[PDB]
Design an enzyme around this catalytic site. Structure first.
Site, PDB file in Angstrom:
ATOM      1  N   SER A 147       8.852  39.290  41.551  1.00 27.26           N
ATOM      2  CA  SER A 147       9.479  38.199  40.825  1.00 27.26           C
ATOM      3  C   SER A 147      10.752  38.566  40.068  1.00 27.26           C
ATOM      4  CB  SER A 147       8.546  37.698  39.738  1.00 27.26           C
ATOM      5  OG  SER A 147       7.716  36.750  40.362  1.00 27.26           O
ATOM      6  N   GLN A 149      -8.645  35.103  46.879  1.00 30.30           N
ATOM      7  CA  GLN A 149      -9.207  36.391  47.289  1.00 30.30           C
ATOM      8  C   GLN A 149      -8.062  37.315  47.642  1.00 30.30           C
ATOM      9  OE1 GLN A 149     -11.974  35.251  50.404  1.00 30.30           O
ATOM     10  NE2 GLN A 149     -13.616  34.977  48.865  1.00 30.30           N
ATOM     11  N   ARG A 151      13.058  36.873  31.485  1.00 28.25           N
ATOM     12  CA  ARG A 151      12.025  37.070  30.480  1.00 28.25           C
ATOM     13  C   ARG A 151      12.559  37.798  29.272  1.00 28.25           C
ATOM     14  NH1 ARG A 151       7.057  35.818  32.217  1.00 28.25           N
ATOM     15  NH2 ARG A 151       6.402  36.054  34.395  1.00 28.25           N
ATOM     16  N   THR A 209       9.563  40.990  35.094  1.00 29.27           N
ATOM     17  CA  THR A 209       8.507  41.737  35.741  1.00 29.27           C
ATOM     18  C   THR A 209       8.437  41.320  37.206  1.00 29.27           C
ATOM     19  OG1 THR A 209       7.082  40.005  34.962  1.00 29.27           O
ATOM     20  CG2 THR A 209       7.052  42.091  33.734  1.00 29.27           C
TER      21      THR A 209
HETATM   22  C1  LIG Z   1       5.402  35.684  41.452  1.00 26.52           C
HETATM   23  C2  LIG Z   1       5.463  37.002  42.180  1.00 26.52           C
HETATM   24  N1  LIG Z   1       4.196  37.367  42.787  1.00 26.52           N
HETATM   25  C3  LIG Z   1       3.052  36.673  42.910  1.00 26.52           C
HETATM   26  O1  LIG Z   1       2.916  35.499  42.667  1.00 26.52           O
HETATM   27  C4  LIG Z   1       1.907  37.597  43.363  1.00 26.52           C
HETATM   28  C5  LIG Z   1       0.593  36.857  43.377  1.00 26.52           C
HETATM   29  C6  LIG Z   1      -0.444  37.593  44.219  1.00 26.52           C
HETATM   30  C7  LIG Z   1      -0.477  39.041  43.697  1.00 26.52           C
HETATM   31  C8  LIG Z   1      -1.816  39.785  43.987  1.00 26.52           C
HETATM   32  N2  LIG Z   1      -2.949  39.322  43.251  1.00 26.52           N
HETATM   33  C9  LIG Z   1      -3.963  38.646  43.834  1.00 26.52           C
HETATM   34  O2  LIG Z   1      -4.024  38.510  45.034  1.00 26.52           O
HETATM   35  C10 LIG Z   1      -4.953  38.043  42.876  1.00 26.52           C
HETATM   36  N3  LIG Z   1      -6.148  37.635  43.640  1.00 26.52           N
HETATM   37  C11 LIG Z   1      -1.554  41.253  43.594  1.00 26.52           C
HETATM   38  O3  LIG Z   1      -1.895  41.665  42.496  1.00 26.52           O
HETATM   39  O4  LIG Z   1      -0.994  41.927  44.432  1.00 26.52           O
HETATM   40  C12 LIG Z   1       6.448  37.024  43.325  1.00 26.52           C
HETATM   41  O5  LIG Z   1       6.358  36.144  44.205  1.00 26.52           O
HETATM   42  O6  LIG Z   1       7.299  37.943  43.370  1.00 26.52           O
END
Ligand SMILES: C[C@@H](NC(=O)CCCC[C@H](NC(=O)C[NH3+])C(=O)[O-])C(=O)O
EC number: 3.4.16.4
Length: 345
Positions: free
Chosen positions: A60, A120, A283, A297
Site C-alpha cells: 500500500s 482465509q 499516513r 505502510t
Molecule cells: C492494502 C494493501 N494490502 C492488502 O490489502 C493486503 C490484504 C491481505 C494481506 C494478507 N492477510 C490476509 O490474508 C488476512 N487473512 C497478508 O497478511 O499477507 C495493498 O493492497 O497493498
C-alpha cells in the site's frame, strides 16, 4: 532530530526474525548519512542473505504514488478534489456525491473487496495470485456490498478507494498508471529500483522473496513472491527498494513532487487512531518522543513495509520484513521508526 539508534535497529530486526520473519532490513537516510542493517534470508530455501538493496513489493505504499499523480493532475487543472468521482467516471459509484477527496482519504464508505478475498489467508492468496482483474472488476466486487457509511463521514480504510484512484489517473490522462508513475515520479527522481509491471509476476533484479504466514499457528510458510498483484494495482502493486522509497518520501515532504498548495491538501489529517492520521494517500504516525513522521505502510503477501520521513524530508526510513500475516512481526517492525527517529532511550 535525535541520532538514529543502530543498536536499537539491530534489536528490532533480530526480534522480527525470532517472531517468524525469514529476513528483515532497514535503511535510514539521515540528511546525507546512511544507516543500513539487515538480518536473515531473502530466500529461506536457498539461504541467500537479505540485504538493503533487495527489491521488494511495497504494497500500500503504492497509494502514495497514486496520490502524487492525482495531486499533480490537480495542479494541472485536470482534477478537482471536491468534484464527485462520477463526474469523471460516469456511472461508476451508486452515490454521485462521493468525491475524489473522500476516496483519497478513505472517507468514501466504499467497502473493501479484499475482506472477501482474504478471509482465509493462504486459500485467498492462491485464488488471486494468478488472476488478472480490470479496474472495473474490482469496483464491481466492492459494490456488491453496500457502502459502510455516508460519504465523507467516517474513516474506513479501503483498497477500493485506490482502485478508483487508478481509474481516475487512466481516464484523465489517457495513459496507463505505469506510464504516469514512470514519467511523473520514477524518472524525475531516478528511482532505478522502482517498477510497476502489472500483471507480470516477476520481480526485476535481485529481490527478497516473500513468505506468507498461514493462518494455522506453526504452519509452513508459503512462497508468495511471484503474483500479479492484480487485486490491488494502483492500490498496491509497486516494486521498490529501501533507497528508492527513502528518496521518494524525502522528495514528497521536501516539496519536490507537487505545488505547496497540493502538499498541504495531502497533509490534511483525518483521524485514524489516537497516534495516527490519514491525509490523501499518506499516513501520519506519532512517535513516542513527540515526533510525527509521514509516509505509508505496506502489507502484500509475504512483505511488510514501513516507509516514513520527517516533516521536511531530511530523514527518511524504509524497513522491510519478508513475511506477512504475522502481527508480531508487523508490530515489531514498526519499532524501526522509534529507533531511527527517536534514537536511544
Ligand atoms: C492494502 C494493501 N494490502 C492488502 O490489502 C493486503 C490484504 C491481505 C494481506 C494478507 N492477510 C490476509 O490474508 C488476512 N487473512 C497478508 O497478511 O499477507 C495493498 O493492497 O497493498
Amino acid at each position: 532530530l535525535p541520532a538514529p539508534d543502530d543498536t536499537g535497529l539491530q534489536a528490532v530486526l533480530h526480534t522480527a526474525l525470532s517472531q517468524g520473519a525469514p529476513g528483515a532490513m532497514v535503511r535510514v537516510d539521515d540528511n546525507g548519512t546512511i544507516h543500513q542493517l539487515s538480518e536473515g534470508v531473502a530466500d529461506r530455501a536457498t539461504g541467500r542473505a537479505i540485504t538493503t538493496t533487495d527489491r521488494f513489493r511495497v504494497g500500500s505504499v503504492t497509494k502514495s504514488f497514486s496520490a502524487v499523480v492525482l495531486l499533480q493532475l490537480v495542479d494541472e487543472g485536470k482534477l478537482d478534489l471536491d468534484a464527485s468521482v462520477n463526474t469523471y467516471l460516469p456511472g461508476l459509484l451508486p452515490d454521485d456525491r462521493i468525491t475524489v477527496r473522500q476516496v483519497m482519504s478513505h472517507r468514501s464508505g466504499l467497502y473493501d473487496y479484499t475482506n472477501d478475498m482474504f478471509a482465509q489467508t493462504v486459500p485467498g492468496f492462491e485464488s488471486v495470485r494468478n488472476k488478472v482483474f480490470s479496474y472495473q472488476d474490482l469496483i464491481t466486487l466492492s459494490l456488491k456490498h453496500g457502502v459502510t457509511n455516508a460519504p465523507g463521514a467516517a474513516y474506513s480504510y479501503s483498497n477500493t478507494n485506490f482502485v478508483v484512484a487508478g481509474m481516475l489517473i487512466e481516464k484523465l490522462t489517457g495513459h496507463s498508471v505505469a506510464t504516469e508513475y514512470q514519467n511523473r515520479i520514477f524518472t524525475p527522481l531516478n528511482l532505478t529500483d522502482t517498477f510497476y509491471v502489472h500483471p507480470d509476476t516477476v520481480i526485476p533484479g535481485t529481490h527478497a522473496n516473500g513468505y506468507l504466514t498461514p493462518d494455522e499457528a506453526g504452519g509452513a510458510l508459503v512462497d508468495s513472491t511471484e503474483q500479479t498483484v492484480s487485486w490491488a494495482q494502483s492500490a498496491g502493486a509497486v516494486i521498490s527498494s529501501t533507497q528508492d522509497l527513502d528518496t521518494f518520501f524525502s522528495a514528497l515532504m521536501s516539496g519536490q513532487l507537487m505545488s505547496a498548495a497540493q502538499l498541504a491538501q495531502m497533509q490534511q489529517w483525518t483521524t485514524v487512531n489516537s497516534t495516527q492520521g490519514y491525509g490523501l494517500g499518506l499516513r501520519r504516525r506519532d512517535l513516542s518522543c513527540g515526533i510525527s513522521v509521514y509516509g505509508h505502510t505496506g502489507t502484500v503477501q509475504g512483505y511488510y513495509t514501513y516507509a516514513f520521513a520527517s516533516k521536511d524530508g531530511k530523514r527518511s526510513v524504509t524497513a522491510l520484513a519478508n513475511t506477512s500475516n504475522n502481527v508480531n512481526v508487523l508490530n515489531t517492525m514498526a519499532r524501526t521508526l522509534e529507533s531511527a527517529f527517536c534514537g536511544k532511550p
